[PDB]
Amino acid sequence: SGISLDNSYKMDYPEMGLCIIINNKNFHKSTGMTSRSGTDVDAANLRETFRNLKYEVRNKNDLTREEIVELMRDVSKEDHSKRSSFVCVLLSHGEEGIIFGTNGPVDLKKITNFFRGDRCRSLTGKPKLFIIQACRGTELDSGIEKIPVEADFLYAYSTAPGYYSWRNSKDGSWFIQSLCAMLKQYADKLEFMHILTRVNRKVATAFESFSFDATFHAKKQIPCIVSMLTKELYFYHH
């Protein structure tokens, strides 16, 4: 055959892969964590968006820290040989490096480790995407105007390190709303990083918080793309 290039991930396997959506809205009273109103809009938006991208979506609601770990481990033990990639969306409360189960925290590292190049062989060399809508701290943005086991991972964080992440009780989170809109519009045209860059701009420009509390009013947000990917990612093929 002619000259061949390996600049982009092979996305023409029989299946695009799984899209696991962990939607945590209601938390155990003892944790003291509030209900995440609007998260169902996010979960529904994501399901439809990835459905159109041909992913095998599995929506899970209100999972405990134990159930999250068990789910991830079981999914990582599946045979992904015929799957092009893997997507996991986490919608919940959080802190830096942590996402909350309904009854307690789960280190993000524990979840992602199940999918390491050496622990999930059927996903080795394939893109593993973790989309996280959760806080990464308590800072507010005031605004102005052999291959590595950690390789082939992409973390599409909703907010910058150490910052709160915003969610609208009626429209859903700023990040997820934007992510889904950008995917629906550009998934058949742009490489993934370029799509996520559009998401960054949308969140950064079109949203500003409104709150009766001066401390939380007029705040801005910027998502955080973290890539360990080794190739360009296009959801379309041929």
């Binding site: 509030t34 995440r36 109103s37 609007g38 919940s92 409360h93 959080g94 809508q133 959760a134 806080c135 909703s158 709160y164 992440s165 915003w166 969610r167 609208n168 009780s169 989170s173 918080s209 409104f210 709150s211 939380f216």
Partner: peptide, 4 residues
């Protein structure tokens, strides 16, 4: 608007 609420924070997570």
């Amino acid at each position: 608007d609420e924070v997570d």
